[PDB]
C-alpha cells in the first residue's frame, strides 16, 4: 500500500466484510432495547441449573464465533496465509472479536446485554457461578459503549484484533506483520478522515482482552471438573476445540 486509494479500498473492503458477517444488525439490536426480561423471567434464568446455563451460553458463543470465522474468511489477506496461521489466529482471536462485537448488543443506559431475544442484566447469568467473569465482560462492554463506535470502526478494530502478528505459533510472522500494518494504516486513515483519532488513546490494552479470554478458560476448567459428562455430551464441538483443550 503506497497510496490513499489503495488504503481506502482496504477500509471499504473490511467494512463490507463486517457487514456481511455481523450476525445481528445494529438496527435490529437498537429496535429491541425496550424488550427487557421481566423479574419473573430473570428469576427463572437464575433457577436454571448451572450446567444448562453454561450449555446455553456455550451454544450462543459458538454460534457467534462461526460468524467471526466467516468474517475472517472474507477478510482481505487472511485466506492467503497458510492454514496453520489461519488456525493460530482464530484459536487466539475468535473469542476476543466476539467480546468486542458484543458491545453492539449492550445498552449502557440500563447495563443490559441482548440474550435470547431480550435484554437482561448481570443477574440474569448468576446460575453460571462465575460472577467476576460476568462483571468483567459487562464492564468491558460498558467502556466500549462509551466510545460510540461506528459500524466502520468496529469492523476495522476487530480486523486488527484478529490479525495480530504477536500470537505464538505463527509460521509466517512477517506476512502477518505486513497484513496488520496495512489494516492499521487503514484504521488510522479512517479515524483521521472522520476526525475520530481521539478514541485511539481510549481503546483498552491488548492485555485486557487476553485477561478476559484467560478468565473464560479458567472458569470453564472449573465447570469441566464438576460436569465432565455434560461438556462431552452437551457442549458444541467447536467450543471444546477452542477452549476445553483436553
Amino acid at each position: 500500500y503506497a497510496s490513499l486509494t489503495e488504503i481506502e479500498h482496504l477500509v471499504q473492503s473490511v467494512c463490507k466484510s463486517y457487514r456481511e458477517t455481523c450476525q445481528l444488525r445494529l438496527e435490529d439490536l437498537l429496535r429491541q432495547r425496550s424488550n427487557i426480561f421481566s423479574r419473573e423471567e430473570v428469576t427463572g434464568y437464575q433457577r436454571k441449573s448451572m450446567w444448562e446455563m453454561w450449555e446455553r451460553c456455550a451454544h450462543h458463543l459458538t454460534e457467534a464465533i462461526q460468524y467471526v470465522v466467516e468474517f475472517a474468511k472474507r477478510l482481505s489477506g487472511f485466506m492467503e496465509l497458510c492454514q496453520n496461521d489461519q488456525i493460530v489466529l482464530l484459536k487466539a482471536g475468535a473469542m476476543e472479536v466476539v467480546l468486542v462485537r458484543m458491545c453492539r448488543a449492550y445498552n449502557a443506559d440500563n447495563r443490559t446485554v441482548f440474550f435470547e431475544g431480550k435484554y437482561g442484566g448481570m443477574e440474569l447469568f448468576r446460575a453460571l457461578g462465575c460472577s467476576e467473569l460476568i462483571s468483567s465482560i459487562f464492564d468491558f462492554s460498558h467502556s466500549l459503549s462509551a466510545l460510540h463506535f461506528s459500524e466502520d470502526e468496529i469492523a476495522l478494530y476487530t480486523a486488527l484484533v484478529l490479525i495480530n502478528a504477536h500470537r505464538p505459533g505463527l509460521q509466517e510472522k512477517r506476512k502477518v506483520e505486513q497484513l496488520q500494518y496495512n489494516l492499521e494504516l487503514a484504521f488510522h486513515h479512517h479515524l483521521c478522515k472522520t476526525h475520530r483519532q481521539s478514541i485511539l488513546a481510549k481503546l483498552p490494552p491488548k492485555g485486557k482482552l487476553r485477561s478476559l479470554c484467560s478468565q473464560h478458560v479458567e472458569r470453564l476448567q472449573i465447570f469441566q471438573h464438576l460436569h465432565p459428562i455434560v461438556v462431552q455430551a452437551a457442549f458444541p464441538p467447536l467450543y471444546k476445540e477452542l477452549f476445553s483443550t483436553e
Partner: peptide, 11 residues
C-alpha cells in the same frame, strides 16, 4: 469433538 476450524476454513 475437535478440528472443526479446519473444516470451516476449507469450505
Amino acid at each position: 469433538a475437535h478440528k472443526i476450524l479446519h473444516r470451516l476454513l476449507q469450505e
